[PDB]
Design a protein around this ligand. Structure first.
Ligand SMILES: Nc1ncnc2c(CN3C[C@H](CSCCCc4cn(Cc5ccccc5)nn4)[C@@H](O)C3)c[nH]c12
Ligand SMILES: Nc1ncnc2c(CN3C[C@H](CSCCCc4cn(Cc5ccccc5)nn4)[C@@H](O)C3)c[nH]c12
Ligand SMILES: Nc1ncnc2c(CN3C[C@H](CSCCCc4cn(Cc5ccccc5)nn4)[C@@H](O)C3)c[nH]c12
Ligand SMILES: [Cl-]
Ligand SMILES: [Cl-]
Ligand SMILES: [Cl-]
Ligand SMILES: [Cl-]
Lengths: 269, 270, 266
């Protein structure tokens, strides 16, 4: 029984899209989620909507958000994020189905197993070699091709602490590190999802070229918002078309392996 | 009406320099500043002096309170003076660097006023940092340093480390490969918070050592830094003293208007 | 009078190895250490032996306790991932540098809230690991026939998660040779306390930078330690008496001066 958590996914909270709408405020051992969970079906697949933020990315309760989705029975989480492009070839409006990250966050709890919550006792060392679910990514990539969307099949997201944008020296340095796109929210979301044994993937939409590029207008909030206004529908279409493909793919082996990975990453006395 | 905040600026708190001296302890929504604000005029320009460390590790300095206080006092400009390590042979101890970029290696530091818990700063702020330091102020600093005959570098990238420890040699080498030219512990988040407050911020960095990336020279220590400052700190003081009246007689309204707009339109509201 | 703090050093707490065994629970201005201190002699040398994510270990209390007990030296043993083909699982690396990728960790005793440590301390880190101790480790490893690398840069990550593959590749480009979660701030605090610090790092995996091999997991690390941990124990046991009969007064005097003159006061 697949159930898809959706974070930041535009306006899928729509009666034309979401059937059986049920709003729900939950509490977790880690505090309150960002918003109420919105339950319902989209193309006959059970979904759980959760708005990520009004709140700086540093302060979003990622632990509570992922814990809530897990407690609701989510097997998958698909997030949508804006991002800056650090590569000429990734143009504003392009989608990037990211497959790696580089952590530049500093203030963020990255584990449920922190020694202070005995629903998560012990110490967890989760592998991150492949942080994003390969099968989900393959469906996203294939669906984007069918929809005719400008889409990159891989890429490394650098997540900065924020809320400030990067300096130019930082932007150039991230390029030398191998980062392709830049944002403020992928970490620790992706990490906590893996700890919970959830298949996690991300739809990243480039909105700007950060500030590395000597021939273009540097990033600002208005530049980001403008590009999203002109392009956000692409991400919504990809997500809507992808959901039923996920609903009719087989997952029991994938989910079993994720469960084992999560389980055997925990050390106990 | 220009008013210049001055942070770490040697001994400008001197009756021969500062006229109308008024000491002042303030409180902010972010807690107490590092020290009392010293108000007065230096060469006919309103100035506000603020010691950065009062005895306090760079990690613990209340940067938010410091910048908020200067903003609340009407400061349009902030000029900071900092010691730094050189990561380049050409930047010798005693040289001044008018930095134009930074690389953040800090970890513990709030970098925004708009943190969701202070309703003098409601919403979320994503301040642009493509050009973190005020270009016009930097141009005045550069031109003034040339006139004073000072060894001065017109640009450079400051890496700011968390501290209070110095860097390892592997860290020092890595920072060179990243494009950093000098290294310190205080530029971030000061520069960031000043931009959020719409203040024209510039920095005078004085190289005091070569960090530890030369295996064939004396590595940095507190005594090496103090020795170089003893032999050279007057250069930074002279630059700052000569610069203040040039800032006082430059036109700023367009520069300040653009900073204000940038700050204002970086804020997202519900 | 040398006294050697030993951290993570396998099972040296053995009556066949450790003589005047005295268990001891201490408190410090920084809170409780990770475990009780086990005092005793190993060969003829006074030693102090010393569930929680690496982020939460009370490194300040641990190092303060060892200092307060009179330790002149600290030798730590650590597992680590290898970021270089030539450093194979089971190899020992006598590390000589680090790169800090931690974020949550106090790295100083002189934090403005403890007046056993008043002022601000800016400790030099050009040479974070004691050269003489490292030379003894290297020479002893050669005598024991152990696979050993005479230098290496440890990147210490915050954890508790392992690194992503993009992170692993990036660390290679930065010059890191091995990767762990505990060297920083341990090495830093030891230098502040004027203690001669060295590290025995044992590679347990290749992290995840090979796209054609099994990535690191807890079970891969545990398996390699089961097959190899005795090497680190042997190195440490054989090294202790060499440290006990080396002269240290100049080395310790210079460390003491460095620590002392790194402190700024009002
Ligand atoms: N150069 C850059 N460096 C670092 N990060 C970025 C970003 C991404 N966000 C954006 C945000 C500031 S603007 C307000 C965000 C509105 C928004 C809405 N959604 C969900 C979404 C995503 C894609 C398509 C449709 C909806 N994601 N973001 C800020 O939190 C950072 C873009 N460019 C960057
Ligand atoms: N290699 C290096 N790595 C990282 N940082 C540095 C520094 C800069 N400071 C120095 C400080 C510890 S020593 C005490 C300095 C006292 C002082 C006094 N002033 C004011 C001043 C500054 C410049 C010129 C004139 C006066 N600024 N600092 C410590 O806070 C860091 C220099 N080299 C570095
Ligand atoms: N790729 C990698 N990236 C980052 N760190 C590592 C490590 C080091 N440890 C390992 C630990 C997770 S597994 C739990 C192992 C339990 C243990 C037991 N001992 C004692 C020991 C150590 C060295 C030599 C002999 C015994 N040390 N660790 C985790 O706490 C970090 C190894 N590979 C890494
Ligand atoms: Cl983001
Ligand atoms: Cl500094
Ligand atoms: Cl970093
Ligand atoms: Cl470790």
């Amino acid at each position: 029984a697949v159930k898809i958590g959706i974070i930041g996914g535009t306006g899928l909270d729509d009666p034309e899209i979401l059937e059986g709408r049920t709003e729900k405020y939950v509490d977790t051992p880690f505090g309150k989620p960002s918003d109420a969970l919105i339950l319902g079906k989209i193309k006959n697949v059970d979904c759980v909507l959760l708005a990520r933020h009004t709140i700086m990315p540093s302060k979003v309760n990622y632990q509570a958000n992922i814990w809530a989705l897990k407690e609701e029975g989510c097997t998958h989480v698909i997030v949508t994020t804006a991002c800056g492009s650090l590569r000429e070839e990734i143009q504003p409006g392009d989608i990037v189905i990211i497959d790696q990250f580089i952590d530049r966050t500093t203030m963020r709890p990255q584990s449920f197993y922190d020694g202070s919550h005995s629903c998560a006792r012990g110490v967890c060392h989760i592998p991150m070699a492949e942080p994003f679910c390969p099968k989900t990514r393959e469906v996203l990539i294939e669906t984007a091709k069918k929809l005719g969307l400008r889409c990159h099949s891989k890429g490394t997201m650098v997540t900065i602490e924020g809320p400030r944008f990067s300096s130019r020296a930082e932007s150039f340095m991230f390029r030398t590190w191998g980062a392709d796109v830049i944002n403020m929210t992928t970490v620790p979301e992706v990490v906590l999802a893996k700890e919970a044994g959830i298949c996690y993937a991300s739809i990243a939409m480039a909105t700007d070229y950060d500030c590395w590029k000597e021939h273009e207008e540097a990033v600002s909030v208005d530049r980001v918002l403008k590009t999203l206004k002109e392009n956000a529908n692409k991400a919504k279409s990809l997500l809507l078309t992808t959901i039923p493909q996920i609903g009719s793919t087989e997952w029991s082996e994938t989910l079993h392996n994720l469960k084992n990975m999560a389980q055997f990453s925990v050390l106990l006395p």
